[PDB]
Every structure is written in structure tokens, then in C-alpha cells.
Write a protein that binds this ligand. Structure first.
Ligand SMILES: [Zn+2]
Ligand SMILES: [Zn+2]
Lengths: 115, 148, 97, 258, 66, 144, 51
């Protein structure tokens, strides 16, 4: 009766925005990225890849409610480096790592199949 | 350079009344230079300490040789040469008690400083002449290094 | 004996007073007999209050239910104003009374 | 440039199983790959059923539920197949769905097993997995009972419904000797060793590693049949990369908007 | 009533294994040996065939309305 | 009964007892993940209780960030020995059973129903009486 | 209205392929009582085709 549709966990409706950046004024060089229709799958990798950056002073993600589909990633960087640049670099490194992983997986699968 | 206390301690006992926590062990230590008694909760998992071990213990108001006070905030990107580089086990805490044998009659001859490093407690007691650098609710750093 | 030792101000022991209070407070605690008279009157009032408490609570149960937690707010005043308990205090006893 | 450089070692590869090891990567990356295995790998499964006749003892929604869980061979077709929502067709077309039909009547005095062999698709590539072991039993028919239905199978992933989950069992583990002490055993001697444990029989745990991090992850991905088990992993890596690419595109738009 | 298509816990196909399980039990297999011979290794899948009650056989005794 | 009607309960009580034990150490990522759920966090990571060999924060530091304002409170754990208060280690607890919150910071002690429950004089009661209903509501939500 | 009581199919959007019956219809949106679920959705009539 009050069952949400199964596509509501991953589909943006009309007028919904995929990612929104809001600079919080508590501390300098900090931003909050609100990503709609995402879950722990992207939040965890983005948080860890930001934690690999020495210029990132804080990297965290959270789901405010499991019944809603929304990820908040708080990124605070050093003053000579922006949180948006940190987020872009983290996504770029994740994409490069996943492409390398996919190519090496294809190579290893061809090695296992051939012998 | 911000040093409040500096001594060499040797461990007389490790967990006398039994081990209460798996990763935290309570060391009872004595001293040579100032005849000090030390009770110290140490994260024994990342920094194992054996019985009879000797270590240099330094209690400092700051981690910089400049003597400049810090803000108590985490700063992994700080590049100034810290005092922690010369030591193995560095804790940060707040001294929460100064007790003594003072009376309404006589001044304090013995002093006990109780410090809480995030819940890991330390009591450093001995002669009052070496405990003048400890004031209640001030943030101190413990820096111990094992001696071969 | 314990009530007398703990709650009566000792304006006679000057050398014990010099570490309890700052020097200019000790000078007019020792000299000014009006201050000593008012402190003795305060102790007499507290002794009368003690006898009243003895009448009200004859089983010796000191656990009461009262509005303001005085000990907690004294601790709060100590922590807010960074009170060092190892130093002489600049608060005169007549100010307290 | 702080990207990992992960390596892959395939230790076992059958028609329903890939056991592989990913080294030199992060725990978050490994867990996100494991989650995409279950939830974000698209396959083809039945999602639209109309029932022209159902004289069986099982009701119509029962039969539709049992039809949705039958896996269909989605290899090399789900990549070139559109989502129904993203398709420009009015109802259904070969660009977004596969049509199945079923028309079984029992006219004999013994029980008729309407199985997944009776599901007839117009696409020769997308067929029930057991039709390519016995067949998945849909319903049993008594004499005089009929089941006549028309179904459409679209593309989707396990985040929407579990019938689009391509995996049976995603076994995932790391640090088999408890060197990192991520779990703390009260009695370590009581615990059996794993398949990947590198300890002798007298030991129960590895010595504690204070500087260690999760750096080697063991997978056993088992396929339900819709995709080959290596195709699940390849499509999972591609899908995670695509999600991150779309997120980076929207992030670039948001950054340039400000 | 009828054997589930999927194992509830993991999603392994157990709907094509009920008749083979009954044939193996008719061949004087023990139930554990029958489950081992069917490839059901996880105990979540083994309880799907072990605990199944085939009520559709009892429902098929009643004559159809048609 | 001049006491709170609601306290920390069930899972939150069991895990705050397990959290404020002396040998609980959180790494940098775990601390940042926990600080993501602290709504009254001012945005600065505190200096860890251990800096070397590895930077580790204790659960008492995180709960000190949870504790609002400058609450001053003394409680005892449910397993506090009777003879300890008259012994030599009364202000340095061997078992971490005397709870001392000072200037809003959990100095020492393991929290339990005697400290976070509905009893009078507890941490939530003193938090109410010193900070107000809004700050105490934030305190409850942040603990959970 | 001439759409109320007519069987209908959602042809666009995330409900595409669902069959329902229009309980209430306006000029812009229509309440489609879905045959497949236990809910009555509200969908604009440009996404609807009449069976
Ligand atoms: Zn189409
Ligand atoms: Zn299973």
C-alpha cells in the first residue's frame, strides 16, 4: 500500500539532481556532496580513494536514512587544494584503477581458458 | 623547549592485579634520576612492552622544539619538525588531577599527576620539585622510547 | 568535633591562612575584628541550622531532594573560571557571607 | 595520482564458478565490486506476464512469480539490449525485450510437468538456462488443466529485484589468518581454518600485523546461469566504471555550474 | 505448495532439483548423499530441498472445475 | 521521580559499554565515519589519544565529542568494586569503572545504564539540567 | 470523463508496460489503478495509451 517502487532506489525523477555541492561554513576548505540515487557502493570507494589522498584532511560518507536513497560525502582538504578537485581526482583514480583491473581480469581469464 | 618532565623509567610490574583489557596493559615503573613512581596504561598491542624494560619518558606541553602551543586539533599535514620523530610511543592527553601530601600545616613535598590519554590513565608521583610543570586541565604529550 | 573542624572558619592560624587566601585578604581577616565576629555569627547560624536539621531528620538520612545542585554548580564554576586549587584564593570570606 | 595497481589471479574457472584473488587494492573497492556482483550487473529476466488461461492449482500471480525467477541466457544480448524505460517503443520491441510464450494443456491421465522447457522464445539467444540437469519446474497440471501465457523479459539488475541478480553465491573474504585482528576470537583454537589459510595445524591465528591493511581478497563468484561467471565479473567492473563515469560527468556539470 | 525456483538465501536454482532429489531418495540414497549429489553444498540450499513439502501433489488429487 | 523518562537503551547501551572500554581504538577512517553521524560536530578532528606508532583515537574521545557543552558528572560502572574507593587507585581506576565527565569530556570510565540510563544524576539528566531540552535531544540522537 | 473506466497501459516513464484501470481522470493526470500491484499511481495522460 505504501510500498515504494523498486526503481526509486536508483532512478532520478524529473527535477532531481544527481550531485549537489554545498560548501559548509564550519571549517575552511570543506564541502558536502549530496548524491541522489546512490548507496554505499559508491560512497565507500569514493571515501577510501579520498582517504588515500595526503591533501585530504577529512573524508567521510553517510546515508541519512536507509529508506531514502541519498549519500552525503563530506570532504575537507588542505587550503591549497579544493574539495571539488579532490572529488574529481578520486573518481579519476577509481576509474583508472577499475579499467586496469578489468584489463588484467581479461588477461588472466584468457590465460586460464587457454591453459 | 616545552618539556614538563624527562626521565628514564624501568618497569617493575606489568598488570599486577590481573589483565583487565586485551589491548591495554598497565605498567608500574620506577625511576633512577628523581625516584619516581609511574602507573601507565599503554596500548600494548601496537607497542609491546616486556617486564623489566627500560624507556625514556618525556612529558611535554607541545610537540615542537619552538615551544609554541598547539590547538589540540589533528594535523597530519603539518611539516614543522616535531618532537615525536625521536620517539616510538606518543600519546596526547589531559592532566586531570594534581594530588599531594600537603596539609593546612605543611606544603606539598610529594606530588601525584593524573593524566588521561583518551581514557588511558597515568599517575606520575614523586618529589614535588619536578612536578611543577603540571597544571590541571592542561593538555600534555607523553613520549616514550625503549632503551636497548 | 568534625562539624567544628570542617565548618568553622579559622581566622587565628595565620600561617595556614596565607596559603588559603591571598595576603591582602589575610591582613584584614586577622586584624578586622568585625570580620571575625561576622564569621563567628555565620558559624553560630550554621550550628543552629544543624540542630534544626537534627530535629527534622532524626534518623540521620542526609539525602534530600532540593532544586539547585550546589556541588555540581561549584564544580561548573571551577571549570569555567579555571580555578587552580593549589593556589591562594582572591575571594574574601566576608564576600561569601 | 593515488590509484591502486591491482592484480588478478584466477585460481578456478568452470561454467558456474570463478575463484579468483585480487591483490594490491582497497577493502572498499573489493566490497563495491562484490556489491555490484549482486545488485548492479544487468541480466535478462521475465518481468511482464499476461495469462490467457490458467486452470492450474496455482493462481496467476504465483505462476508469474515463478516465471520471473527462471534465469535466461543473457550472454552477449543484455549489453546490446535497451532498458524498457529508456526505449522509444510504445509497448515492447526486440530492442528492449524478449518475448516468451507458453501453451501447455494436460490431456493425459498422468501429471504434466510444465517446466522451463515449455517456455518458447522468439530470440534463439535468450532461452531458459536449463534448456541450453533437469528443467526448472513451473507448475504441475492435472488432466483438463491448462496454462497459456505470454511473457516479456526485459533488462535489469539486482538492485531492483532479486530475479535480476546473476549470482548464486558470492563468497568473499580477506585476511584468512586474522593477521589484522578485524575479528577477535575469544577462543582462537575453536575456529576452523579457511580454504586460503597459510597456517600450520598447531597455529590458530597469524601474529598480529600492526602496519597491515586488507590487501588481498578472495572471491568465489557462482553464477545462477544467466551469465558466465567471468562475464558477471567483467560486466560488474564495466558497470562500476560506468557509474563512476556518469557521476564524474554530473560532477563536472555541477562544478561548471557554480 | 511447489518447490521454489530460487533458494531464498542465495538464489541458487533449486527448482530443477526436486524430481531428481525424489529419484535419488528412491535409489536408496541418504538425504545428505542426495543433496551432495545434486551440487547443493551451502546449507541454505540444502534446507530448500530438505524441508520442502510438496503440497501440489495433494492439490492435484481434486478434480479441476473446467 | 525527578529523573529522566528515557535513556540510552538496548543496542546503543550495549555498544556504548563496549565503546568506552579502555582498549577501544579507532583508526582514522573509522573516526571520520563516526564523525559523519555527529550532528553537533564543529568540524575539526581532535588530536588522537595515540599519535605514534599509528594515529589511534579512543572511544572516549569520540563520546567526548558527543557529550554536549561542559557537562560535569561522576558516575560508577555497574562492575565497580566496593573496596576501590578506599584503595590507592581510586582516581586511577584499574578496571576503568569510575566515570568522570569533566568540561564535557569523558575523562575516564565505562558508560552504562548507571550513566546513560534513566536514573537520577546520570549523564542525560545532568545534560538536561545544564543545557536544555534541545541540546539534550541532540545528545540522544548523536549517541544513537 | 471518457477515460474513467477504460483499461490503459503506461507507455512512457518508469511504469512502462504496466496495465491498469483509470479510476479518476483529469485533463493533465489520471489515477491508474494498477493490475500488477496493490497501489493506484498518478500518471500524466501523455504516458498512457488505451488498450
Ligand atoms: Zn523497446
Ligand atoms: Zn542457497
Amino acid at each position: 500500500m505504501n510500498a515504494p517502487p523498486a526503481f526509486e532506489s536508483f532512478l532520478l525523477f524529473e527535477g532531481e539532481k544527481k550531485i549537489t555541492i554545498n560548501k559548509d561554513t564550519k571549517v575552511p576548505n570543506a564541502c558536502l556532496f549530496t548524491i541522489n540515487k546512490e548507496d554505499h557502493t559508491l560512497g565507500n570507494i569514493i571515501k577510501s580513494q579520498l582517504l588515500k589522498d595526503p591533501q585530504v584532511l577529512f573524508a567521510g560518507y553517510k546515508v541519512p536514512h536507509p529508506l531514502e536513497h541519498k549519500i552525503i560525502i563530506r570532504v575537507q582538504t588542505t587550503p591549497d587544494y579544493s574539495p571539488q578537485e579532490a572529488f574529481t581526482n578520486a573518481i579519476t583514480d577509481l576509474i583508472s584503477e577499475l579499467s586496469l583491473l578489468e584489463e588484467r581480469f581479461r588477461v588472466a581469464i584468457k590465460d586460464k581458458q587457454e591453459g | 623547549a616545552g618539556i614538563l618532565f624527562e626521565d628514564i623509567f624501568d618497569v617493575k610490574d606489568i598488570d599486577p592485579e590481573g589483565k583487565k583489557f586485551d589491548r591495554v596493559s598497565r605498567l608500574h615503573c620506577e625511576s633512577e634520576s628523581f625516584k619516581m613512581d609511574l602507573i601507565l596504561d599503554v596500548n600494548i598491542q601496537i607497542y609491546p612492552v616486556d617486564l623489566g624494560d627500560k624507556f625514556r619518558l618525556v612529558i611535554a606541553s607541545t610537540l615542537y622544539e619552538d615551544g609554541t602551543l598547539d590547538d589540540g586539533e589533528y594535523n597530519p599535514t603539518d611539516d614543522r619538525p616535531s618532537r615525536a620523530d625521536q620517539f616510538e610511543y606518543v600519546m596526547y592527553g589531559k592532566v586531570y588531577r594534581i594530588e599531594g601530601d600537603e596539609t593546612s600545616t605543611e606544603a606539598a613535598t610529594r606530588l601525584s599527576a593524573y593524566v588521561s590519554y583518551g581514557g588511558l590513565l597515568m599517575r606520575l608521583q614523586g618529589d614535588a620539585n619536578n612536578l611543577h610543570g603540571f597544571e590541571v586541565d592542561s593538555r600534555v604529550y607523553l613520549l616514550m622510547k625503549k632503551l636497548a | 568535633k568534625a562539624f567544628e573542624k570542617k565548618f568553622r572558619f579559622d581566622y587565628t592560624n595565620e600561617r595556614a591562612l596565607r596559603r588559603t587566601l591571598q595576603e591582602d585578604l589575610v591582613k584584614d581577616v586577622l586584624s578586622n575584628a568585625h570580620i571575625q565576629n561576622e564569621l563567628e555569627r555565620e558559624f553560630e547560624r550554621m550550628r543552629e541550622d544543624r540542630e534544626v536539621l537534627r530535629v527534622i531528620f532524626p534518623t540521620g538520612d542526609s539525602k534530600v531532594v532540593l532544586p539547585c545542585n550546589l556541588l555540581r554548580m561549584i564544580w561548573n564554576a571551577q571549570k569555567i573560571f579555571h580555578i587552580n586549587p593549589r593556589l591562594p584564593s582572591d575571594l574574601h570570606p566576608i564576600k561569601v557571607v | 595520482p593515488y590509484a591502486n595497481q591491482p592484480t588478478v589471479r584466477i585460481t578456478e574457472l568452470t561454467d558456474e564458478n570463478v575463484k579468483f584473488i585480487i591483490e594490491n587494492t582497497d577493502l572498499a573497492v573489493a566490497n563495491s565490486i562484490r556489491r555490484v556482483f549482486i545488485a548492479e550487473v544487468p541480466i535478462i529476466a521475465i518481468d511482464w506476464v499476461q495469462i490467457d488461461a490458467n486452470s492450474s492449482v496455482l493462481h496467476d500471480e504465483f505462476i508469474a512469480h515463478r516465471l520471473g525467477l527462471i534465469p535466461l541466457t543473457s550472454d552477449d544480448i543484455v549489453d546490446k539490449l535497451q532498458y524498457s524505460r529508456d526505449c522509444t517503443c510504445e509497448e515492447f520491441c526486440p530492442e528492449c525485450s524478449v518475448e516468451f510464450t507458453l501453451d501447455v494443456r494436460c490431456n493425459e491421465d498422468q501429471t504434466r510437468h510444465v517446466t522451463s522447457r515449455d517456455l518458447i522464445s522468439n530470440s534463439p539467444r535468450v532461452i531458459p538456462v536449463t534448456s541450453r540437469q533437469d528443467d526448472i519446474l513451473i507448475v504441475k497440471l492435472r488432466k483438463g488443466q491448462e496454462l497459456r501465457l505470454r511473457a516479456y523479459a526485459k533488462k535489469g539488475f539486482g538492485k531492483e529485484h532479486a530475479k535480476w541478480n546473476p549470482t548464486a553465491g558470492v563468497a568473499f573474504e580477506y585476511d584468512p589468518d586474522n593477521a589484522l585482528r578485524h575479528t577477535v576470537y575469544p577462543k582462537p583454537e575453536e575456529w576452523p581454518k579457511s580454504e586460503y589459510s597459510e597456517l600450520d595445524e598447531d597455529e590458530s591465528q597469524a601474529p598480529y600485523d600492526p602496519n597491515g591493511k586488507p590487501e588481498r581478497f578472495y572471491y568465489n563468484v557462482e553464477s545462477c546461469g544467466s551469465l558466465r561467471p567471468e562475464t558477471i565479473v567483467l560486466s560488474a567492473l564495466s558497470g562500476l566504471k560506468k557509474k563512476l563515469s556518469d557521476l564524474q560527468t554530473q560532477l563536472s556539470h555541477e562544478i561548471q555550474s557554480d | 505448495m511447489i518447490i521454489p525456483v530460487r533458494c531464498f538465501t542465495c538464489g541458487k536454482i533449486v527448482g530443477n532439483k526436486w524430481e531428481a532429489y525424489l529419484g535419488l531418495l528412491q535409489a536408496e540414497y541418504t538425504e545428505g548423499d542426495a543433496l551432495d549429489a545434486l551440487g547443493l553444498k551451502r546449507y541454505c540450499c540444502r534446507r530448500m530441498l530438505l524441508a520442502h513439502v510438496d503440497l501440489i501433489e495433494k492439490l492435484l488429487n481434486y478434480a479441476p472445475l473446467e | 521521580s525527578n529523573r529522566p523518562v528515557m535513556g540510552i537503551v538496548q543496542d546503543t547501551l550495549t555498544a556504548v559499554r563496549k565503546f568506552t572500554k579502555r582498549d577501544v581504538f579507532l583508526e582514522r577512517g573509522e573516526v571520520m565515519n563516526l564523525l559523519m553521524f555527529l550532528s553537533t560536530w564543529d568540524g575539526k578532528v581532535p588530536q588522537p589519544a595515540i599519535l605514534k606508532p599509528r594515529p589511534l583515537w579512543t572511544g572516549k574521545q569520540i563520546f567526548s565529542l558527543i557529550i554536549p557543552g561542559h557537562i560535569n558528572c561522576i558516575r560508577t560502572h555497574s562492575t565497580h568494586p566496593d573496596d576501590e574507593d578506599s584503595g590507592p587507585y581510586k582516581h586511577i581506576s584499574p578496571g576503568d569503572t569510575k566515570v568522570v565527565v569533566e568540561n564535557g569530556e569523558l575523562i575516564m570510565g565505562i558508560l552504562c545504564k548507571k550513566s546513560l540510563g534513566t536514573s537520577a544524576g546520570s549523564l542525560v539528566h545532568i545534560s538536561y539540567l545544564e543545557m536544555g531540552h534541545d541540546i539534550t535531544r541532540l545528545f540522544y540522537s548523536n549517541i544513537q | 470523463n471518457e477515460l474513467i473506466g477504460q483499461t490503459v497501459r503506461i507507455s512512457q516513464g518508469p511504469y512502462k508496460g504496466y496495465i491498469g484501470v483509470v479510476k479518476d481522470a483529469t485533463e493533465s493526470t489520471a489515477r491508474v489503478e494498477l493490475h500488477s500491484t496493490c497501489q493506484t499511481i498518478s500518471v500524466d495522460r501523455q504516458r498512457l495509451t488505451t488498450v
